[PDB]
Amino acid sequence: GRLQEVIETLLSLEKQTRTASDMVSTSRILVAVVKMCYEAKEWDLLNENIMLLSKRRSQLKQAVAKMVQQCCTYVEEITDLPIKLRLIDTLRMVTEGKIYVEIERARLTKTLATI
Amino acid sequence: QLKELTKQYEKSENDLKALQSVGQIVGEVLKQLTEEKFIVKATNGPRYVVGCRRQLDKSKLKPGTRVALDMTTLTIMRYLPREVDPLVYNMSHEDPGNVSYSEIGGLSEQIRELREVIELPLTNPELFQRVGIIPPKGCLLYGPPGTGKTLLARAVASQLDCNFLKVVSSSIVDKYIGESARLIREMFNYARDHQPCIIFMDEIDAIGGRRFSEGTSADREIQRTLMELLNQMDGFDTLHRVKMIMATNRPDTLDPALLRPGRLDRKIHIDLPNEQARLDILKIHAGPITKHGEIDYEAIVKLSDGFNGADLRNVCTEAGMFAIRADHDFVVQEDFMKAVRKVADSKK
Amino acid sequence: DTLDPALLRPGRLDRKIEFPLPDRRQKRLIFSTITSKMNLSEEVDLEDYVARPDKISGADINSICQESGMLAVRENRYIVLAKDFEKAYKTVIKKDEQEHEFYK
Ligand SMILES: Nc1ncnc2c1ncn2[C@@H]1O[C@H](COP(=O)(O)OP(=O)(O)O)[C@@H](O)[C@H]1O
């Protein structure tokens, strides 16, 4: 329903952002992938893209890093009530191993220590 | 008539008061602060019992301290710090020529890798026991010649902070017996003093092993020097701050004992330029020479492979030679083209 | 091989201890120890690289496992999962030999 908006634009993004500027766009389009992947209010199609954005990132003078502010400026956006959270589950085997993601498993550990 | 002689003559009255002095022999106190008398070891000399200064700081006179002794009476004088050789002609000076990674061409993987393994434990050591392992110590820059070995450590020489001990391994050895082991324990103890430090021993086939059976004088003198160098690369610590890297041709004549991960962990194969690195070297040594615009680098790189960085600066050197006996403005395309085809004549 | 044939003679040594360049039933214990002092995320396997038993010291086990961790420092990772293990091993997992087909 709202798949090919984010995915079609993202297919247009992977040659104008990835090749090769990306840097401030690391804080722009990936955060736009997740906020336009949140404005349509999906939770099945939400946790199917962040893990499909890894494994191959960009060229020289850009970075594989700096999606941690793409994560941490998105986690504390919803406080959905009963329990459903794949936000707590999917973000504990996709963010495996970075020095920048200390606040991910730390403050999401605190999220597990409260909910 | 008086201030002149007062200053530049009465300043030179110092020659008599300094001429009165007597000089002091040196030695190493084998400790045993036998309270009122210690036993010291002179340098070429016997061990013997010496009295003391009587208000010296005896409590820090540690076993193995350089101390100065009187000549005639022979009572111990003012102490000394631990000496250094002309390792000053080793540490304090090498070949760091403001050469940077800009002159290093086409081996960005090898120099980013060597830079990370050698000084990145000195930038962020806390990430390694975080992972749960000590950082490695040594790298062996084996490759065909040319290729940027000695230099590579020139670029490392002019981009680091610690005293880059850059030594040729054949100015180590001397004609006296047990002398080279003195020099190598002096080198590594000097590395213990200033930390963290990098020790560059290139061309090391002088100390390089595959130890023999029979030459018995000119080789077993070094095959016990390699024992001291080997048993201080290893030691009983891990040296814990200093990292040595060695660069040589012929890795297939080195000792197995010195190659076992530990003495030299990440053996780096620096390799001949492929095509991309060929045009890298060609641009870098073709840089400061005046040029054309649309000078066809691509046919030069396409033309004949198997060169080295030295052979490509030999190309630009021969083409500038062609203009310098031919009296032109810079080169032409036929001067690079006449340059490679005479370097290609230079096979073995 | 050239020590001296008068350094033993039951009085100066009386002993001799061979160190084996270990194999199958020992190699597993070396990997178990050296991996037991690291961070692992269990995507690793143990006996897969105990397999291919080919001419290793313990020093190069510390080199491929130490090199596995240091190759995991690239992505600033506090563990090691799959490639840095296999990756470092293959890179310097004996940088090969020289077989020699027909005979064999
Ligand atoms: N990648 C390279 N870029 C520039 N010069 C190189 C490169 N590789 C080798 N050289 C040449 O090698 C010289 C340095 O000596 P080197 O190649 O290390 O020989 P050795 O390994 O015997 O010291 C330099 O003067 C340089 O011209």
Q: Whose CA is nearest to atom 5 of ligand 1?
A: B309
Pairing status of strand B66-69 against strand B268-269: unpaired
DSSP single-letter state for residue B138: -
Helix (H) or strand (E) holding B4: helix B3-10
Q: CA C25, CA B117: separation in Å to the nearest integer?
A: 33
Q: Is residue A84 within a helix (H) or strand (E), and if so which, with residue range? A: none
- Ligand 1 and B248: CB distance under 6 A: no
Q: Resolution in angstroms, to 1 decimal, for this deposition?
A: 3.8
| 3-state secondary structure (DSSP) of residue B277 | helix
CA atoms within 13 A on the CB side of C68: 28
Chain C nearest C-alpha distance from A97 (Å): 4
Q: Are the C-beta atoms of residues B246 and B201 closer than 8 Å to each other?
A: yes
Scan for tokens 């590395």, then name that residue.
Answer: B191
> How far, in Å, from the CA of B310 to the mean position of ligand 1?
6
Compute the distance from residue B104 Cα to the ligand 1 centre, in Å. Answer: 9
Give Cβ neighbours of residue C8 (< 8 Å, ≥ 6 apart). C14, C16
Burial class (CB in 10 A: 0-12, 13-18, 19+), B137: buried
Length of chain B: 348
DSSP secondary structure string for all residues of B155-188? HHHTS-SS-EEEEETTSS--SSTTHHHHHHHHHH
Q: Which residue has the tokens 């930038």?
A: B123
Report the b/e string of B74-107 with b at 16+ CB within 10 A.
Answer: bebbebeeeebeebeebbeebebeebebebbbbb
How far away, in angstroms, is A85 Cα from ligand 1 center?
Answer: 59
At B50, the amino acid letter reads V
Listed residue (B140, B204, B138) closest to B172, CA to CA? B204
Q: In which region does residue A80 sit, left (phi positive, over 0), alpha (psi from -120 to 50) or beta (all else)?
A: beta
- CB of A92 within 8 Å of a chain C CB? The answer is no
Q: How far is A94 from chain C (nearest CA, A)?
A: 12
What region, left, alpha or beta, does residue A55 occupy, with left being phi > 0 and alpha being psi -120 to 50 degrees?
left
On whether any CB of chain B is under 8 Å from the CB of C22, the answer is no
Which chain C residues in 51-80 lie under 8 Å from chain A, judged by CB atoms?
Answer: 72, 75-79
**Among A64, A97, A99, beta carbon nearest to C79:** A97
Report d(CA A2, CA A43) in Å as an integer: 12
Contact at CB, C62 and B261, closer than 8 angstroms: yes
State which H helix or E strand residue B271 sits in. none
Question: B147 alpha carbon to ligand 1 midpoint, in Å?
Answer: 5
Distance in angstroms (rounded) separating the CA atoms of residues B300 and B313: 13
Query: What one-character DSSP code corresponds to residue B199?
Result: E
Task: Please tell me the experimental approach by which this structure was elucidated.
Answer: cryo-EM
Q: How far is CA B49 from CA B30, B36, B62, B64, B79, in A?
A: 10, 10, 16, 15, 16
> Tokens in use for B161?
């902070």
Surface-to-core class of residue B143, CB atoms within 10 Å of its CB (0-12 exposed, 13-18 middle, 19+ buried): buried
Q: How far is the CA of B338 from the centre of ligand 1 (A)?
A: 23
Burial of A70 from C-beta contacts in 10 A (0-12 / 13-18 / 19+): buried
Beta B76-79 vs B66-69: how paired, if at all? antiparallel
CB–CB contact C76 A96 (8 Å): no
Torsion of CA A94, A99, A101, A106, to 10 degrees: 110
By C-alpha distance, which of C35, C91, A108, A63 is closest to B131?
A: C35
Ordered DSSP codes for B26-89 = EEEE-----TTEEEEEESSS-EEEEE--SS--GGG--SS-EEEE-SSS-BEEEE------TTTT
Q: Look at strands B164-168 and B198-202 and give their pairing.
A: parallel
- Long-range pairs for B8-12: beta carbons < 8 A, 24 or more residues apart: none
| Cβ-defined contact of B131 to C65 (cutoff 8 Å) | no
Taking residue C20's Cβ as centre, other Cβ atoms within 10 Å add up to 6
Q: Which two tokens stand for residue B122?
A: 């000195």
For residue B314, report the phi and psi dihedrals to the nearest 5 degrees: -70, -30
Q: Whose CA is nearest to atom 21 of ligand 1?
A: B149
Distant-in-sequence, close-in-space partners of B181: CB < 8 Å, separation ≥ 6 = B224, B225, B227, B228
Asked whether the bond before A20 is cis by omega within 30 degrees of 0, the reply is yes
Question: Backbone dihedral region of B102: left (phi > 0), alpha (psi from -120 to 50 degrees) or beta?
Answer: alpha
Which amino acid is present at C75?
E
Beta bridge partner(s), residue B50: B38
Residue B66, judged by CB atoms within 10 A of its CB (0-12, 13-18, 19+), counts as middle
User: What does the alpha-carbon distance between residue A37 and residue A95 come to, in Å, rounded to a whole number?
Assistant: 19
Identify the bridge partners of residue B244 per DSSP, sorted by sequence position.
B199
The finding on whether B268 has its CB within 6 A of some atom of ligand 1 is no
Decide if B286 contacts B292 (C-beta within 8 A).
no
Pairing of strands B243-246, B198-202: parallel
CB < 8 Å to A96, chain C = 41, 77, 79, 81
The Cα C7–Cα C14 span in angstroms is 10
Question: Rounded CA gap, B294 and B51, in Å?
Answer: 82
Secondary structure (DSSP) of C40-101 = --S-S-SHHHHSS--S--SHHHHHHHHHHHHHHTTTT-SS--SHHHHHHHHHHSS-------
Check pocket membership of B149 for ligand 1, CB cut-off 6 A: yes
3-state secondary structure of B269: strand
Judge whether A104 and A95 are in contact, CB under 8 Å.
yes
Q: Give the distance, in angstroms, between the CA of residue B162 and the centroid of all CA atoms in the same chain.
A: 12
Angle at B112 between CA B106 and CA B116, to 5 degrees: 165
CA-nearest residue to B268 within chain C is C92
* Per-residue tokens: B34: 């036998």
Q: What share of chain A is helix, strand, coil (3-state, %, to 5)?
A: 40, 0, 60
| Contact indicator for B114, B269 with CB cutoff of 8 Å | no
Best to test chain C binding among B120, B131, B252 (most C CBs inside 10 Å): B131
CA dihedral B138, B139, B140, B146 (to 10 degrees): -140
Phi, psi of B200 (to 5 degrees): -105, 110
Peptide bond into B46 cis (omega under 30): no
Q: Residues B58, B21, B70, CA angle at the centre, nearest 5°? A: 35
Strand extents, DSSP E, B98-157: 139-142
Q: Report the alpha-carbon distance of residue B222 to residue B207 in Å, rounded.
A: 6
Distance CA C7, CA B271 (A): 46
What residues of chain C, 71 to 100, have a C-beta less than 8 Å from chain B? 72-73, 76-80, 92, 95
Q: Which residues contact B315 (CB under 8 A, 6 or more apart)?
A: B282, B285, B300, B307, B336, B339, B340, B343
- CA–CA gap between residue B186 and residue B191 (Å, rounded): 9
Burial B259-290 (b: 16+ CB within 10 A, else e): bbbbbbbbbbebebbeeebbbbbbebbbeeee
Q: Following DSSP, what letter does each residue of A40-83 receive, concatenated?
A: TT-STTTTTTSTTS-S----TTS-S---HHHHHHHHTT---SSS
Nearest 5°: the CA angle B7, B9, B14 is: 100
Containing B25, the helix (H) or strand (E) segment is strand B25-29
Taking a C-beta distance cutoff of 8 angstroms, is the pair B74, B24 a contact?
Answer: no
Partners of residue C70 in chain B, C-beta under 8 Å: 117, 128, 131, 133, 135-136
Q: Does B132 touch chain C (CB under 8 A)?
A: yes
Residue type, B318: E
